[PDB]
């Protein structure tokens, strides 16, 4: 719920996409088991896809660890300092691929309610309404009952 959780305004990290676009995902770490069935998809993914993925994204460093684990995870890590954990446990090659893509294209900002869909510095070009902006000025600048 919205009163329940935290919230943030819509932002970019380091004004991304203004001057130039910087892919925010920094590194990607897989942990899987050569033996265990739970990791099956994750193995296939490492065989076929990882290689190609690594060419498609030169800027992300990908660490693959075979180790004896029951639950294969992928740890995304971002320029933001943000660390996002995921479980590739018991998924297809297809599913993992889609997941790794989501990770690739995310900002690394926290996922919470976003208060409003737009963010503007200087929304106000040509003025910002104030009580006097549409009022006519009088002669001498007298108040309503003021006499001179």
């Amino acid at each position: 719920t919205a009163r329940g959780t935290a919230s943030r305004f819509l932002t970019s990290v380091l004004h991304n996409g203004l001057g130039r676009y910087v892919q925010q995902l920094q590194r990607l770490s897989f942990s899987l088991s050569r033996d265990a069935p739970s990791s099956r998809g994750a193995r296939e993914f490492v065989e076929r896809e990882v290689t190609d993925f690594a060419r498609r994204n030169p800027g992300v460093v990908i660490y693959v660890n075979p180790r004896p684990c029951c639950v294969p995870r992928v740890v995304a890590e971002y320029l933001n300092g943000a660390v996002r954990e995921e479980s590739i446990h018991c998924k297809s090659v297809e599913e993992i691929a889609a997941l790794v893509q989501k990770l690739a294209d995310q900002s690394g900002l926290d996922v919470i309610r976003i208060r409003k869909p737009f963010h503007t510095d200087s929304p106000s070009i040509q003025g910002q309404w104030h009580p006097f902006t549409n009022k006519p000025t009088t002669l001498g600048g007298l108040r309503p009952r003021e006499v001179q």
């Binding site: 920094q26 030169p58 992300v60 460093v61 660490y63």
Partner: protein
């Protein structure tokens, strides 16, 4: 008793979470953590910024004095022979100096070209601001420079980080032309100027005086403060709008709680019109000439 591993293990995780909540562990270098290959990291830095560096020059750029002196502490305390290979390290001092000098020059030129009416004191203030401790550290740490930098004391105190950022700039200046580096500077520094004011970063304390001097320079005479709009004078929350007039034309105008505050505002506004630092002003150009 209940028979199973599962809930017990799963609870061991909760125990660890609470342990980390009540005593937070002091922040550790990304280098001393499980997945690290320094080389691959460096290459990725370069590729992700869409730049081309000499790996020798960059690896040089992330080296600091402190890292070397601490390395000499570890060298001298264990009785090891390092000196040749360790003093071969070629620190980043040089690169950082070229970097800061060029960046200040570059920036200064950018502003001078964009705001012809900015007094030299102003453009100086601006370059000072975008080269500041705060801004540069923020940007550097968000580009994973703090990640790669070799230094004692992991939080990497701000002067070291400024050093290291501009070190990378200089490394770029050697690796590629002043053109390329000018683009990098206008992308990762000048953008921190987005949304900001003039007098947010300039800090000048007497707007009226400065205005009068600038109008002497423009051969205009005597700004006269003339009260324009007001609501409640007797209230605890009055509003004044003071206008500034030169030969009965209105140059600029401002709001405030007090007539003095407002007069000062009208001054700041006038200044902002004269100098062409304004809200309506043309947004910066990001383009490929």
């Amino acid at each position: 008793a209940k028979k199973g591993f599962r809930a017990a293990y799963r609870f061991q995780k909760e125990l660890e979470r609470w342990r980390l909540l009540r005593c937070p562990p002091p922040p550790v270098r990304r280098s001393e953590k499980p997945n690290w290959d320094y080389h691959a990291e460096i290459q990725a830095f370069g590729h992700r910024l869409q730049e081309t560096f000499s790996l020798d020059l960059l690896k040089t750029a992330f080296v600091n004095s402190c890292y070397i002196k601490s390395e000499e502490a570890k060298r001298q305390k264990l009785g090891i022979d390092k000196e040749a290979a360790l003093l071969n390290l070629k620190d980043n001092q040089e690169l950082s100096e070229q970097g800061i000098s060029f960046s200040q020059t570059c920036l200064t030129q950018f502003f001078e070209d964009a705001f012809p009416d900015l007094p030299t004191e102003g453009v100086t203030s601006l370059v000072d601001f975008l080269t500041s401790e705060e801004v540069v550290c923020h940007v550097a740490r968000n580009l994973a420079v703090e990640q790669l930098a070799l230094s004692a004391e992991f939080p990497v105190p701000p002067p070291v980080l400024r050093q290291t950022f501009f070190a990378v700039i200089g490394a770029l200046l050697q690796s590629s032309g002043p053109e390329r580096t000018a683009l990098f500077i206008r992308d990762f520094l000048i953008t921190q100027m987005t949304g900001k004011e003039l007098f947010e970063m300039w800090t000048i304390t007497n707007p009226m005086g400065l205005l009068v001097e600038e109008l002497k320079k423009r051969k205009i005479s005597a700004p006269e403060s003339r009260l324009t709009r007001q609501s409640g004078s007797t209230t605890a929350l009055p509003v004044y709008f003071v206008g500034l007039y030169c030969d009965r034309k209105l140059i600029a105008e401002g709001p405030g709680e007090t007539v003095l505050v407002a007069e000062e505002e009208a001054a700041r506004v006038a200044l902002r019109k004269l100098f062409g630092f304004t809200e309506n002003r043309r947004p910066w150009d990001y383009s490929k000439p």
